[PDB]
């Protein structure tokens, strides 16, 4: 079933806009009909084939083409969904919230404008992948690391703008951003920070520049199209020691989170702390069929086999030490002593692991910024599928951690899915992350998934736990949880949207923000 | 001599507003006539007495009184100048850009709403001083440090919003901000981040919340009135070692900046690096008259007597080590060895300083977040004066440091002032900071000051060095240096200003931002 037209746009307006788009980028860089397939969400949730359907895609080569495209979108009221590389799998891929939206795919704007070793930064266009930035650095022998999600075909820009995370000390991608160029919804171009100063050499050295700090308003946003972005890069460290701490009991997560709190608040653990459930970690190297025959989620007897077999606990804390050995030894003493008295705890460094293909060896690559695509193998746990996550924010306490594990594993298993969870800590923020793998081809699984997801959001919100990043299908739902003072915050986002984008042509419904023409 | 009415506002409109303000906050907290004196800039620059003249001040007790004052302001078209404590000495104090603006003084809103030890944060109203928050922490025995901008009587909120800086690893005050409550220009109230979720306990734990990141637009801004603000607080570390490294030769600053760069990018130096000129450091414990009776800048023979008398160099680098001894020793080895081979270099710890009142003993207090008013001593160098500062951003290069030292020291000395200066480094950002001490009572000195200041701006901008914070007199002048693409960035600020504040009643001219009614 073909995408419907966006409401308020005629066949003739759409036909005219797509031909005008083709005059700007070339007929070969406007995609309709059979060539739209890759812009669909690969992990379908809806059973309604009229939802989240991109009408076409346009793939520009430059900021100047983006500006022209934006002006044509305003001329015809044809809305655009900007993507850097459009690999936002688990969140909708390249697909828009509103059917009939045209994808603006900036994949071909893939110039690495600068990599600066002595100041540790890069200035990149949206099409630059983590693979590409990593290869450039390696090729040029620069003593810099990148910070990669578990998945390396993504965008250094796109991932950061969606408040993406990785597994080095530079793991908060948007916090490491510094300077951007934006095409505003009127088609005019602006630079933030020191980029506003002609002849500056400081665009990537100082975030604020002068006056209001606005870079943030173009993250998780439909206020602009980002065409260049700076990012800080970690200088190669004097040493690197990745580790795995395993815990034998499901209830250990309570005391583990209590012990993690001071180590994370003080910065003794130098990267994000990630504590993964047994099945989430097993799914890298194993399938359910190799330990259990049921079509249901696993029983506890299986869990015990997997633990001894894979040298994993019910909870698996991956982290890493960075810097000269005397620093790494001192921090390690602090971290190890924090967990040594827990019955059944085990400590591993890479040389301590007895398997060739191993969770610590796999996570050790990500914790030093090596981009890969091996993480997608976890989707084969239950025969093959898509994934979606729920990652709300809570205080770093044992009580909050065990409450979420209990609430979520209960609900997920009620709907026929194995519980795959982790407790993640950035700095002062805990996230219980629910990872759900589903057969996206099965209408009944899709219906169960949607119904489950809505229960997780509601029960989390009732405890004061709010989502920070979500799939196109739930962007309205998450926005409505942020309801303080009768939705005061979204009223302010709406005022800013109407000011910058009076015709509502950028990404209708992104982050639950809709302009005056569609509200 | 009395302040003029703001243009467009009648005596009747003003008198009605003031009558309504008195009923909102009480007659004892609307200040007119003789009681306006404290709201004048204490360090006058302009010789035109009709400039930067507040008409009156209102001191509300609560967010509800702020909302009512803002609605009254919209009713009568009376503009407001929001200050948290108005201690912005060197930037115009509590005085507005535009004469006849009424000061909205929130010093009486001084509740410490929360200090959380296990998560290391505070939630504060704008009237909370560094002195008050430090005294609160000390009395309850909480193992937390604050970060002070050497001006104990200032606002935790107000300083952060103006992008203020201190001397611990938490020195970027606005970077450590997390959650705020803002009264918007229509008098409606909003909470950013996790504060938009009813029942959250995460407002001070996670900056972003969901959707666009907007806290930044209320910093160095007239988009809103901040009434509550969270800030991250450093856990008391396992150890603290403040140090002073002196350089004999003014030309040493070139090689010193070169060696500082990798140490700062990599985080081996854990706080801001501050490299202060002889006179700036000497003026802390001595006056010019102790060494030289002439009215001109000191000569070189006097500089050398001062260096020998005080154990100071032409350049004085104060920094501190934080954390467990084995970490501090490792970082000290790298820092020490970076400078050991410079002829004339000297290394001091507190126990190495002979003088009882001593640069390093005062700086050691600031670099562990002990609030003081010691820093004001440099105003007595030439018998008593005010100060203004020029603090543009540059790359951390010897060539940029020595260029700025030569082009500024020559000009300031040319106009008859002693050069007092420093090279400060945040993380990747160099600042050559010019401190100009002048007789604020003397119209001739004021005129030489204004002339010198304008030359320093133009010569800096010609090199691509832009200011990040300035005095109310120069806010339009600095805005105009950020002129990339025919002033694109300020056209965007103006679009947001007109959307949030259609009647232009918040702080007209803050950061060179004027609404449509005044532009
Ligand atoms: C197995 C697996 C593992 C994953 N691991 C991680 C992980 O560790 N960490 C993580 O963060 N994510 C992870 N993800 C989620 C996701 O796949 C990645 O974050 C991915 O990199 C995002 O796609 P992208 O980088 O191509 O960004 P894009 O798809 O290009 O951008 C994402 C969104 O940002 C906005 N946007 C992008 N570019 C612009 C622009 N120029 N202007 C304006 N708005 C723009 C749009 O709303 C767009 O839809 C994982 C997913 C899976 C399935
Ligand atoms: C000798 C000397 C040393 C100094 N040392 C330092 C230093 O080391 N570091 C440093 O950073 N500064 C320094 N200063 C500058 C200044 O004195 C301090 O930064 C001081 O703390 C700022 O005043 P305040 O905290 O009362 O802020 P305020 O005066 O209350 O606020 C400053 C500005 O921010 C805005 N603002 C404040 N509150 C709000 C609000 N609630 N809503 C909206 N806008 C608001 C307004 O535009 C206001 O004018 C120094 C000054 C002198 C003379
Ligand atoms: Cl460029
Ligand atoms: Cl819209
Ligand atoms: Cl409160
Ligand atoms: Cl510590
Ligand atoms: Cl205005």
Residue numbers in the entry:
A (entry chain A), B (entry chain B): 1 to 519
Sentences from the paper on this structure:
Enzymes of the vanillyl alcohol oxidase/p-cresol methyl hydroxylase (VAO/PCMH) superfamily are found across all kingdoms where they perform a range of metabolic functions. These flavoproteins share a conserved FAD-binding domain and a more variable substrate-binding domain that enables interactions with a range of substrates. One of these, the 4-phenol oxidases/dehydrogenases, catalyzes the oxidation of para-substituted phenolic compounds. A fundamental distinction is that the oxidases efficiently react with oxygen producing hydrogen peroxide whereas the dehydrogenases hardly react with oxygen and typically employ other proteins, such as cytochrome c, as acceptors.
Pro151 was substituted with isoleucine and valine to mimic the N5 environment of EUGHs. We found that P151V and P151I can operate with oxygen although they are 10- to 40-fold less efficient compared to using 2,6-dichlorophenolindophenol as co-substrate. The crystal structures of the six P151 mutants were also solved. They are closely similar to the wild-type regarding the substrate-binding residues whereas loop 150-153 locally undergoes localized rearrangements, with each mutant adopting a distinct conformation. In general, the oxidase-active variants (P151L, P151G, P151I, P151V) all adopt the trans conformation that slightly shifts the amino acid at position 151 away from the flavin. The analysis revealed a consistent pattern: in the oxidase mutants, the 150-153 loop conformations create tunnels that lead to the flavin re side. The ability of nsVAO to use oxygen as electron acceptor thereby aligns with the oxidase activity observed for the P151V mutant of VAD.
